[PDB]
Symmetry: C2
């Protein structure tokens, strides 16, 4: 079968990439008991066993193969548009129940607060089980990831796509049951399956959304001021026990991929500048600062650093990365060196680097770090330490240095979620490990390495395969991959917080925690 | 062997790309008698029969494998910096001799006009042959491609890099011979060979330049007007054998990747606007136009189309392309269709596509072409016609439609040579096959398909492998790949043209030909 052969070919290619450019390989072997040859053979088997396999079947097989890595950065996308969608968003409470937190339809058969019990007579938990990955570890991050998929299936992601009618069994707030019959919003595949075509081929002849700007938390109280610009920021108050009020500032960091922020005008001042503006206002008109960082996909490390430099008046140690190398990385190293050869002054550093690297202040020390990074990469290469090098800080940055102008220095409370990845893992890790802020919520996802994408012509319809080129290592050791960061205060969302989207219990605890931060100082 | 295993792995990947996305495959088998499996098996053996193959060795093998396709578009570049360079430039004359046409170093022995005889006791010809590809066919274009590397060796291209001193045997124009000892300008490798590092790898534990703006031709006559922008363009007076003078425009199109033009300012107006300005000047102050398009690397098809649109007052038929298809191309087709789904008017087209596409004026006609393109691709896919599809015009443009404002409609003479690739192959072919211009010079290279690049992580140091995704077909059926485009008048550069860089013989003949075009007296004959 033409399809089978191409799938095997492409599978063998993905398999080779895992051996030459997947840094967390050793970790997955121990942490998950995963074996490359094992999975490979296993995947090869499903392909060879199928009777006249369809392209979509093969795509599913390769997608599951990569999914077996239990790595939120690692996945495969395909040139396929088939999809199925239902207009609802459901969230799981700490007690384990599922409620509709968002209804995007004019139908009133299902309302906010209603509880989801089953899908086609199967308890929600069973259905989610069919959406789990090959090496599911039962974490909340994995579960939430599956929940994203419950009512949105995409062939472009290698999902088996459903269609037609289905029944949703729900529980109304007064306790009784209703079975709601709905029909999936189906978009048929527009990219013809190779299998169907194969026989005729002749030889050629011559804001509950990740990255949401606003997020999903309501303001903590009467608002005295807000910004409404690019970032969602405002100032409210918290009243302690002695009856005294404290102006508290609020700011949400939706993503570390600034160019993708809602309403970003590339022809306007960069987002890090608007950030600085907000911080300044907060610096002299706020007592503490709550930073909502939940439901954040991560993004640019340099941008992550820029924001970190504006939240401290002291240097912050940064975790290092164990990298997997190829001569590609060697050339980058050589390029940093030739680029900074004659850099000896701050003036020259700004002319060579731009004085601003995605918001981060370019110092002579920056050039020095970049210089060190590269010498270290070259050293590792010559030493043969290329499978998983000794930790080297990204860009050579040993630590973050406070922004020269804006420096919020008052107490900070960072809210984390199981839907915080990469830079969204690193943000709390840096503030927590340096003791600059109080971390609250639930453990981050654990996407602990930088991502990179690979594209290549092929007939299996593979569009992109993202992989992980490094293994972040926290100061006291311990990887972030899978593990993520535990908050200082584990504060999950209750059924009461979620049901009507009020988060009253949740916000009340946070406001109290901020009070203690103001009064007890740290 | 680590290096060997990786080399074999990456070779196998390249070989697979050649069966899934290399449109000229069927053409190479017939034009070269080339065979994929066999060339692969041969490469594998070279890698397997090696003791401790170094990375650079394997890079050379992979580079030679792709070089065997005899495709100016197909090639591999590597993450390597080692290189050797000698500050000279040679040009081969029509009588087969090699002459120095440029010296780029302090006052030394070699003079412009010297004939290059040998390199280390070996005649130039033999040295050049060592630089040919596996399926070299002796075409002038392949000869020049090899000459480019005579004094420029790069590990980045898979070349073996020499170093140290070497002797150049030359002959002066008055006859005497001289042996000039010269030293290669060498840059050592900065990327450590993996073969050397392998044993310590432990398991992981927790001018004449192609694309030159000015080119190398001297002015054709006394200049009456000279443009001051990005393009070299002017107006001079050309006189016939009777002493009758005519005003003639001269314009050089250096490249079709407009963004790479010398001194291009991305913050200023696009080059097609300046081109338009020049043509308007030519339309009102000239009787004919000479376009120097020699030594041009090709570039953007849409930009090429914009320039053609300003050189005609009638539509020009375009050659179509036979394409190799994957679902990547299918998605493109679908997107064009969704993008133009509700476009039924000109204003609608301009809103969806912009007022112009890299200079080419946007119309409803353009929108309709793009939709037709999508349908034909989708139709080929559903029929299984995916290895080498029936001819389909790029972007669906069946023909070039005249620019609405600027249209040069007087006679045109285009100068071409063996160092014209892709769009530089296409420019003269469109003008020739539509009988719009007189094409003069030597046959173009023949990079007859669009290029695309592939990147992927590997331990062999491969940076990019460019391949060809289509085979262009001229109106009458001939392909462009390898064969190139023939001129109406074959006019090579003679030794007298080259010896002192005057090209007076070449230019005097170009002028006689232009006068005949202006005269409009029967058939245009050289003499």
């Amino acid at each position: 079968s033409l399809v089978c052969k191409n799938a095997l070919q492409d599978l063998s290619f993905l398999e080779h990439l895992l051996q030459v450019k997947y840094a967390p390989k050793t970790w997955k072997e121990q942490y998950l008991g995963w074996d490359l040859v094992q999975s490979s053979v296993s995947a090869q088997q499903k392909l060879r066993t199928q009777e006249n396999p369809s392209t979509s079947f093969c795509q599913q097989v390769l997608a599951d193969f990569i999914g077996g890595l239990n790595d939120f950065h690692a996945g495969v996308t395909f040139f396929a548009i088939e999809s199925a969608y239902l207009p609802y968003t459901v969230q799981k409470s700490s007690d384990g129940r599922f409620y509709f937190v968002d209804i995007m339809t004019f139908s009133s058969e299902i309302r906010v607060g209603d509880e989801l019990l089953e899908v086609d007579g199967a308890p929600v938990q069973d259905v989610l089980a069919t959406l789990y990955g090959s090496n599911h570890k039962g974490t909340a991050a994995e579960e939430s990831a599956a929940l994203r998929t419950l009512f949105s299936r995409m062939a472009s992601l290698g999902h088996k796509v459903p269609s037609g009618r289905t029944t949703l069994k729900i529980r109304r707030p007064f306790g009784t049951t209703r079975e709601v019959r709905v029909k999936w919003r189906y978009v048929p595949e527009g990219v013809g399956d190779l299998a169907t075509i194969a026989p005729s081929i002749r030889a050629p002849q011559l804001g509950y959304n990740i990255g949401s700007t606003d997020g999903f938390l309501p303001v903590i109280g009467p608002v005295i001021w807000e910004s409404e610009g690019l970032f969602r920021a405002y100032i409210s108050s918290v009243t302690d026990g002695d009856g005294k009020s404290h102006k508290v500032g609020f700011l949400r960091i939706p993503t570390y991929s600034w160019q993708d922020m809602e309403d970003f005008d590339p022809s306007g001042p960069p987002p890090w500048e608007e950030f600085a503006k907000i911080i300044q206002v907060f610096s002299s008109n706020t007592e503490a600062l709550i930073i909502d960082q939940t439901n954040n996909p991560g993004g640019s490390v340099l941008y992550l650093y820029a924001l970190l430099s504006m939240l401290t008046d002291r240097p912050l140690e940064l975790p290092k990365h164990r990298m997997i190398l190829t001569q590609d990385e060697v050339v980058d190293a050589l390029d940093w060196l030739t680029l900074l050869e004659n850099v000896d002054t701050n003036v020259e550093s700004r002319l060579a680097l731009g004085d601003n690297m995605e918001g981060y202040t370019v110092d002579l020390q920056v050039a020095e770090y970049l210089k060190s990074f590269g010498r270290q990469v070259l050293n590792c290469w010559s030493k043969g330490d290329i499978e998983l090098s000794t930790p080297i800080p990204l860009f050579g940055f040993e630590k973050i240095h406070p922004h020269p102008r804006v420096q919020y220095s008052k107490p900070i409370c960072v809210l984390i979620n199981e839907q915080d990845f990469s830079c969204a893992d690193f943000f709390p890790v840096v503030l927590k490990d340096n003791d600059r802020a109080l971390i609250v919520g639930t453990r981050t996802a654990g996407a602990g390495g930088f991502v990179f994408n690979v594209q290549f012509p092929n007939r299996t319809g593979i569009k992109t395969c993202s992989l992980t080129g490094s293994l972040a290592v926290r100061e006291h050791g311990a990887f972030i991959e899978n593990i993520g960061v535990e908050p200082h205060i584990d504060l999950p969302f209750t059924a009461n917080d979620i049901r009507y989207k009020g988060y009253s219990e949740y916000l009340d605890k946070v406001k109290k925690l901020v009070c203690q931060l103001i009064n007890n100082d740290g």
